[PDB]
Task: structure prediction
Amino acid sequence: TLDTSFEDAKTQVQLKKIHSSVILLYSSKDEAVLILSEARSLGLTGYDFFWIVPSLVSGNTELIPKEFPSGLISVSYDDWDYSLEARVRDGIGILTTAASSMLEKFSYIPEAKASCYGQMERPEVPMHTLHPFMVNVTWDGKDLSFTEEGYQVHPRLVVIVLNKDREWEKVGKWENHTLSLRHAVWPRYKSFSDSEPDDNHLSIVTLEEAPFVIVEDIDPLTETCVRNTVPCRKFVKINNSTNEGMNVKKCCKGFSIDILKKLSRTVKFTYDLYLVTNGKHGKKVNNVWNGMIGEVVYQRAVMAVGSLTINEERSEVVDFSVPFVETGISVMVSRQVTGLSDKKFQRPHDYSPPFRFGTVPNGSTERNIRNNYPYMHQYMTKFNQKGVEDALVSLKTGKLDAFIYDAAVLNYKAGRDEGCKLVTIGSGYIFATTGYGIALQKGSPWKRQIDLALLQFVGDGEMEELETLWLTGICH
Amino acid sequence: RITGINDPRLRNPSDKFIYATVKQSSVDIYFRRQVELSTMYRHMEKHNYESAAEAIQAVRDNKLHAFIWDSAVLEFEASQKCDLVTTGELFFRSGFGIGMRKDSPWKQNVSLSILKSHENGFMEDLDKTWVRYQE
Amino acid sequence: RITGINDPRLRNPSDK
Amino acid sequence: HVSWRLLDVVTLELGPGGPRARTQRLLRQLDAPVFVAYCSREEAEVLFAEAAQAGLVGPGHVWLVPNLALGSTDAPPATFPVGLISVVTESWRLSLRQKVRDGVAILALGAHSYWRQHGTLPAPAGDCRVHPGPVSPAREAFYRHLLNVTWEGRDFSFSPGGYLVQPTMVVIALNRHRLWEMVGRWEHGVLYMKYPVWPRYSASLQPVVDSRHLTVATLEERPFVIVESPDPGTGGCVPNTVPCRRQSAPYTKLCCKGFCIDILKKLARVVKFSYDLYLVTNGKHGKRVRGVWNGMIGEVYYKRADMAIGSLTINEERSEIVDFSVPFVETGISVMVARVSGLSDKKFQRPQDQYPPFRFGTVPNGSTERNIRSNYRDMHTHMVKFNQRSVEDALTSLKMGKLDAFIYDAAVLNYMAGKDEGCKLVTIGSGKVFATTGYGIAMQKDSHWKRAIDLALLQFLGDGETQKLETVWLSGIC
Amino acid sequence: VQLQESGGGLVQAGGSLRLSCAASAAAAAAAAAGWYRQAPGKERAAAAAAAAAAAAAAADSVKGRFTISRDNAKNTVYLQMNSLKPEDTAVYYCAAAAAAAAAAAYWGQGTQVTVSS
Ligand SMILES: *[C@@H]1O[C@H](CO)[C@@H](O[C@@H]2O[C@H](CO)[C@@H](O)[C@H](O)[C@H]2NC(C)=O)[C@H](O)[C@H]1NC(C)=O
Ligand SMILES: *[C@@H]1O[C@H](CO)[C@@H](O[C@@H]2O[C@H](CO)[C@@H](O)[C@H](O)[C@H]2NC(C)=O)[C@H](O)[C@H]1NC(C)=O
Ligand SMILES: *[C@@H]1O[C@H](CO)[C@@H](O)[C@H](O)[C@H]1NC(C)=O
Ligand SMILES: *[C@@H]1O[C@H](CO)[C@@H](O)[C@H](O)[C@H]1NC(C)=O
Result:
């Protein structure tokens, strides 16, 4: 709290002692002009801050004063679209109907005072007032019942903002205890001009995959989910493509998301997430791209995280950071060959009937596999698996015999499994060792900082701890 | 597989062993005060009993796999009864104490009496009477 | 009987 | 070396005349417990008067100024708030005769070192009117040879710049009677101080002890507390250790590390209090010789400290006078033997058979000594011939065979067998624990600090880091 | 929201044009604006983009022929195109995405640009 009596920079002393984003204040209109004026000098009117005010602050006017930052949240009653005549008509009905209920109930006459009270007030005192009958009024499609203190329980609150033209514009409505808003995510527009760096608030795209990133529906106890988890706006393809299609808030967690949550506590980020639309990772076909790689090349999001594989083609168009987890490709079989040179893989012309491969199409390995020797892949064209879980059960039943995919996830699936019946060939044999990292837009200044910070956590012994929680070993 | 609290068999949910406690107890608030064990907290809140000896009979009836409780009570029940085994060793230590309303006129004598009992040693004699020799 | 991260032999040093 | 958070930097016009308002309003728009200022004598006067006017000279703030200020060094000016700190060179209190003798000695020693090199005094070059002279090698060599001297219990080694290096100066401050006095020395990159804490002064001569800065006592013992001398690697000791002074006016700066030190360091941050740690003088834990209580209990009972961390066992005798917190580790009486079935065994109960003459422990002046003396007269009488030098000599004697059994605290013996030559063990184990109790934190009677620290320590123990500290500092091999 | 595209016509090869798309909204600071091209027989293709931060990306296919610009004060993005070639004959479209909303792909009626001798 601040003492206006000391109207000098002593207030700025107490005011300077708070560092945070959202500031809430409760003061009068005249003092509001001065306090916001002082903040603009120090810099709290910056682009990163949010001001929240109650109704009484400048609500009952159409001419805004100066020194108020462009962009303000208030919940008021001003009722932009309502009319006084509408309010008066409701008020008149409250008068007549409530008195009608009391008068007709007991033939009650509302005895009036002979004048304004000099002496003749006393005889009307014993007469019962309308309070027992004025608390409850009906009609007009609204429970206009009052209370002891004289405030309604069914009001008409609205939320309103300061637009660019210094003209108040309605945003959302409050009715039947819900927050209906015309805005899904915050607009984040600037303060009063001549101060607008606006170089922050990165957007991030992510895919739902193996334990790197996991998606879940929002818990219905409080329409949110437990702390230590980040919300993310998943798109949908609507119901039967009839119409609409709702951007549904559903928080998501996992490994890759956790690392940036701790990462952005030392680089001061502000972030939002939305998942993918089409495809799984991406492929450069017909000289065009789609996927997260496609998203970044067209500036959909400055950053891009998740399960992303570093490779020759990918680094040609977009830059990559220093990898933090080692991986590659591997093969998984049930319960009889040495590897990429094994003669069994060379030709299916052996005495035994041919066996099959998993080799999920439209991936990263397939493009790499095409590069060295083709004849295996045209064999793989005949039989292509789908998904991940669908592939493993097919191997378990005996529809396939040699599943090929990246090792960083096969070791997990073999670990958290039943009976340890599935293993990888050899002692964790690996081919074409490769790392996983975070890709950023080309030429961005984020390059040096994001690299240095990511390397620092590796030294502090944090990767081991985070690995253990989401990389468990049951068969180990 | 039964061991201390490090295994994936207890770290991750599995139908081989079903864990539970008694509702509205210290273990509940202990497991509800850690973000890192939300899945375990939800699994426990899925179903739990409200009893002391009934759960012992149920596990003795091969209906329940295993559950967790205090040290002295479990250790006495295991040895006093038949065909019971103590799993592992303690992980979180705590004590038992007499509780009184805040600012009571009895704090002073109580502590000195307790320490006098500890010094004389017939509290150990009571322990010998009740939890030492089952004959 | 040595553990790289932390072992009784190595965390606490002696003549051996 | 350290983070050194810096608040802000301000420059202001300090002329003899002008409109004060711009500087006056700005100066009061500040908040920092420590100020450093650099200016001239008149500037010092005007700035200090202005600061005294706009309320920045109370007991809460401290001023630092370099040697450029303070002028005479012999005349104390007015308007100076007591507590000003500055640094001046040595021999300030000496006499002019001493200084001129020092200069004569410097030049004479230079010449004395010189004549051996060349055989005679350097040629005297002097001409007011003529002003000749390009670079002359002989005088240059003389100047070179002049740069290093010694003797007279000091040093004067000049750099290329016209100033001496490796200096010896003294910290100076304004005493409570408006008089200059010494505070701290500085010799070879290490620093000292007259006081362990900074007093600060009220309006009157009486200082304000104020809140916080709790006095805490301890003594050297098992790895709960370890005393280590500072190492020359940094002219001290590294972090993860806290400086500790061995009280007895002069003091040598040690720094102490251990279990209790770690728990105190962890506790300090949450409740946000200040502390200074100092060792006990008389030592030997606690005792009551006709009401003359020594050790940590003696220190805290006579209102000479605020807390006494470290090894201490809660019992009936001690708790009557001094309040305690909750325990944090388990302990009690145990028995140690070379590689008996309890206290009530006839061997310790009936010392009358001469064929197995056993031996005991009983480090005197011990907490358990009072218990064993109060509960069993015969054992106390027959325990006179017992080894008593330390928790170290007993182990050696047992490894020799000069004794048969050892009795002492539990949490220290069970660790002492953890890392030992071979594997010397004890009886059945934790199942043989007598008068089970714990270590605790003592505090002065009737203080809010007692409740605050107790609740904080309960919360910490419920958190579970105590197991981590135990496995870091209380693990053994055997 | 709704947008509106205009600026087309017939211009000889090597000429220039100024296409424009505009929409109404009080938050116009934060919208990606992109240009799409779809010729007969070919799939829709990206041409030029503008980011929220203020970066410009140009497709390598017809790089250097045109240029993009956005006015923060007035809600309209107009595309300045130069050195026309017959390969550019198509109907250009304007679009926005994100900052709220759903069903995110927004397409105008269309403006046809014709390049020929
Ligand atoms: C001060 O330093 C100078 C180094 O030049 C010393 O003076 C010379 O020391 C060398 C050592 O071999 C002698 O051979 C020369 O005769 C000295 N004169 C010259 C040429 O510099 C000087 O000795 C040092 N201080 C002391 C302790 O004497
Ligand atoms: C206990 O501490 C006291 C205080 O330091 C020690 O005092 C000695 O007491 C014995 C008699 O019990 C005297 O003969 C010595 O002259 C005293 N002084 C010293 C320096 O030993 C005592 O040694 C400690 N132990 C006992 C059993 O009292
Ligand atoms: C995989 O590629 C085939 C090629 O015909 C395509 O039909 C299919 O939609 C792709 N699946 C993806 C990208 O998920
Ligand atoms: C503790 O006991 C004493 C014994 O006389 C008596 O004063 C009272 O019962 C208790 N005193 C306090 C202060 O609790």
User: Anything to note?
Assistant: The first strand of chain D starts at residue 34 and ends at 36.
